[PDB]
Enzyme design. Structure first.
Site, PDB file in Angstrom:
ATOM      1  N   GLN A   1      -3.118  -0.019  11.725  1.00  0.00           N
ATOM      2  CA  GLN A   1      -2.875   1.344  12.205  1.00  0.00           C
ATOM      3  C   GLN A   1      -3.932   1.877  13.171  1.00  0.00           C
ATOM      4  O   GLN A   1      -3.605   2.570  14.141  1.00  0.00           O
ATOM      5  CB  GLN A   1      -2.736   2.313  11.023  1.00  0.00           C
ATOM      6  CG  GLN A   1      -1.371   2.296  10.356  1.00  0.00           C
ATOM      7  CD  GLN A   1      -0.274   2.887  11.241  1.00  0.00           C
ATOM      8  OE1 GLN A   1      -0.200   4.108  11.426  1.00  0.00           O
ATOM      9  NE2 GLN A   1       0.591   2.025  11.779  1.00  0.00           N
TER      10      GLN A   1
ATOM     11  N   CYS B   1       0.889  -1.153   0.000  1.00  0.00           N
ATOM     12  CA  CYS B   1       0.000   0.000   0.000  1.00  0.00           C
ATOM     13  C   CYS B   1       0.931   1.208   0.000  1.00  0.00           C
ATOM     14  O   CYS B   1       2.100   1.065  -0.353  1.00  0.00           O
ATOM     15  CB  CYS B   1      -0.904  -0.014   1.243  1.00  0.00           C
ATOM     16  SG  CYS B   1      -0.020  -0.007   2.858  1.00  0.00           S
ATOM     17  N   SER B   2       0.464   2.380   0.417  1.00  0.00           N
ATOM     18  CA  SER B   2       1.362   3.552   0.502  1.00  0.00           C
ATOM     19  C   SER B   2       2.665   3.307   1.289  1.00  0.00           C
ATOM     20  O   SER B   2       3.745   3.231   0.710  1.00  0.00           O
ATOM     21  CB  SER B   2       0.635   4.778   1.070  1.00  0.00           C
ATOM     22  OG  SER B   2      -0.074   4.451   2.250  1.00  0.00           O
TER      23      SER B   2
ATOM     24  N   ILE C   1       2.016  -0.615   5.755  1.00  0.00           N
ATOM     25  CA  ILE C   1       1.763  -0.957   7.154  1.00  0.00           C
ATOM     26  C   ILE C   1       0.286  -0.901   7.574  1.00  0.00           C
ATOM     27  O   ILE C   1      -0.154  -1.662   8.450  1.00  0.00           O
ATOM     28  CB  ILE C   1       2.604  -0.087   8.149  1.00  0.00           C
ATOM     29  CG1 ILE C   1       2.166   1.382   8.126  1.00  0.00           C
ATOM     30  CG2 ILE C   1       4.100  -0.197   7.871  1.00  0.00           C
ATOM     31  CD1 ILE C   1       2.803   2.211   9.259  1.00  0.00           C
TER      32      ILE C   1
ATOM     33  N   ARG D   1      -3.225  -0.703   5.556  1.00  0.00           N
ATOM     34  CA  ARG D   1      -3.984  -1.704   4.788  1.00  0.00           C
ATOM     35  C   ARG D   1      -3.249  -3.014   4.616  1.00  0.00           C
ATOM     36  O   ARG D   1      -3.841  -4.101   4.745  1.00  0.00           O
ATOM     37  CB  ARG D   1      -4.266  -1.188   3.389  1.00  0.00           C
ATOM     38  CG  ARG D   1      -5.240  -0.074   3.347  1.00  0.00           C
ATOM     39  CD  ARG D   1      -5.376   0.401   1.940  1.00  0.00           C
ATOM     40  NE  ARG D   1      -5.988   1.711   1.950  1.00  0.00           N
ATOM     41  CZ  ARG D   1      -6.230   2.423   0.864  1.00  0.00           C
ATOM     42  NH1 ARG D   1      -5.893   1.939  -0.327  1.00  0.00           N
ATOM     43  NH2 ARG D   1      -6.804   3.616   0.979  1.00  0.00           N
TER      44      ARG D   1
END
Length: 502
Positions: free
Chosen positions: A480, A433-434, A437, A439
């Protein structure tokens, strides 16, 4: 360790705390009550308090005027020593010097808050093991507490009399805590940590070791529905369960030295969100990528950031080296007008080279929640290194929050699982993902839990926070938000019912 975090305090209370018990340089973190999901860094400076927003939208902690972090522990560690360049608008430095410690014990693993004498003995008798202990509020003595410790040998139900449970009263008088004699403590955590180091010894010689908190998170998969009900709703629920998990993040501050190296700095999407050295993927085809192996403690995963233009080649090197045959992308290339991942695969039917790797986009299928891309990966100069890589691109993850129904995720991961399984000796499933950590963490943990149930049936034990903690010790900050935490429970519950309905 994480004592500077105050989970149930208000903004004004935090001000008064810093003004009455703090000095200039004192600080604490707290959940934002105004901005749920977000946090506030409250610092005393020049005689007064400033509040500094910390946003978390599911991808990372974004410190206002600071940087992006994988956990609050890592953010605080960052400033409280090397590269504490926290500033404000004017450009003034804000110093984080004196952690203002919290006395609330709710997020202690051994603190069960509201609970009775009978249920406590139930837990200790069944899950209990030598050195297992716990602390509950006294119902017979309000304001007071009971510490209960199991000593002996084996665990679980017994009748050999070779084990026993002892109960020790903890008096709360004039805001301090004691076990009826000796030192008085400013909080239950101080007291407990003192008696872990200096065990209580009975006259006849039984040493009351406070070895491990009792597990109260593990459940039988069948009854997850009931557990969700209770956690949903006084006795501790979802919030406390999550905050208890967050508290243990302070055990995970391993080195990430290779990430901080100058040569590799620009190979990280976010400068402070780095892989642990001891689980990072080492490319021995330099040797650095922002990725970690996640191993359930047969199928493994690689959690990684979305590629940058200068790491696309390294991404493909990683895929080839690890023999990975399935790639899970949980992000659009751009979300909320932010780059999250560059396109690292050719357009359909096209062929591209990425340094020494060559990739062909063979065919794209679309489904409701995702697009599938069949890619052929090979090493140039070597017309036998061709392997098929399946890229699953999940596109229906809402831009804010988590999906209202987990059914799309479940159907997606089911499909991903069958693909992996069909390919003998396939290496880890790559998930990104970005930052790799939020998603990523959520998808991986869900996938881990379902696999336990798929293999062992409705009648197995699952432990969500323990699975998460195990995954967090392998990549920083996996899962998160409390939102995602609830979503994991919903997904495993939903899976259970679709299992039983058939």
């Amino acid at each position: 360790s994480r004592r500077w975090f105050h989970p149930n305090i208000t903004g004004v209370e935090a001000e008064n705390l810093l003004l009455t018990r703090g000095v200039d340089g004192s600080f604490l973190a707290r959940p934002s009550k105004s901005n749920p999901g977000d946090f506030t860094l409250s610092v005393r400076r020049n005689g007064a308090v400033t509040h500094i927003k910390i946003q978390n939208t599911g991808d990372y902690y974004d410190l206002y005027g600071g940087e992006k972090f994988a956990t609050l522990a890592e953010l605080v560690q960052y400033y409280m020593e090397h590269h504490g360049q926290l500033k404000e608008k004017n450009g003034d430095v804000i110093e984080l010097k004196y952690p203002l410690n919290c006395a609330d014990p709710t997020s202690e693993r051994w603190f069960h808050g509201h609970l009775s004498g009978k249920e406590a003995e139930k837990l200790l008798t069944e899950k209990g093991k030598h050195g297992s202990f716990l602390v509950r509020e006294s119902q017979s003595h309000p304001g007071d507490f009971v510490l209960s410790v199991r000593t002996g040998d084996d665990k679980g139900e017994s009748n050999d009399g070779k084990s026993k449970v002892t109960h020790v009263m903890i008096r709360c008088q004039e805001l301090k805590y004691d076990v009826g004699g000796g030192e008085r403590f400013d909080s239950l955590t101080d007291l407990v940590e003192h008696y872990k180091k200096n065990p209580m010894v009975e006259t006849l010689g039984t040493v009351l070791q406070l070895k491990q908190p009792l597990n109260t998170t593990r459940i039988n998969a069948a009854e997850i529905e009931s557990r969700v009900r209770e956690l949903s709703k006084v006795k501790q629920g979802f919030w406390e369960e999550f905050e208890t998990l967050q508290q243990q993040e302070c055990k995970l501050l391993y080195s990430r030295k290779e990430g901080q190296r100058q040569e590799n700095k620009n190979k990280n999407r976010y400068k402070n969100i780095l892989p642990f050295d001891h689980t990072r993927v080492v490319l021995h085809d330099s040797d650095y990528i922002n990725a970690n192996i996640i191993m359930p403690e047969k199928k493994s995963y690689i959690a990684t950031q979305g590629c940058l233009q200068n790491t696309v080649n390294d991404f493909w090197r990683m895929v080839f080296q690890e023999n990975s045959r399935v790639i899970v992308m949980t992000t659009k290339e751009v979300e909320r007008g932010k780059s999250k991942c560059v396109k690292y695969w050719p357009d359909e039917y096209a062929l591209k080279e990425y340094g020494v790797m060559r990739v062909r986009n063979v065919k794209e299928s679309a489904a409701h929640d995702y697009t599938l891309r069949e890619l052929k990966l090979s090493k140039v100069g070597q017309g036998n290194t061709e392997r098929t890589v399946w890229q699953y691109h999940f596109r229906t993850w809402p831009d804010h929050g988590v999906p209202s129904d987990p059914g799309g995720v479940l159907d997606f991961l089911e499909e991903v699982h069958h693909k992996q399984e069909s390919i003998m000796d396939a290496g880890p499933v790559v998930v990104h993902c970005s930052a790799g950590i939020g998603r990523t963490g959520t998808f991986i943990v869900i996938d881990i839990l379902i696999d336990i149930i798929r293999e062992k049936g409705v009648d197995c034990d699952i432990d969500v926070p323990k699975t998460i903690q195990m995954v967090r010790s392998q990549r920083s900050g996996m899962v998160q938000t409390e939102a995602e935490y609830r979503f994991i429970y919903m997904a495993v519950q939903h899976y259970i019912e679709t299992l039983q309905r058939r």
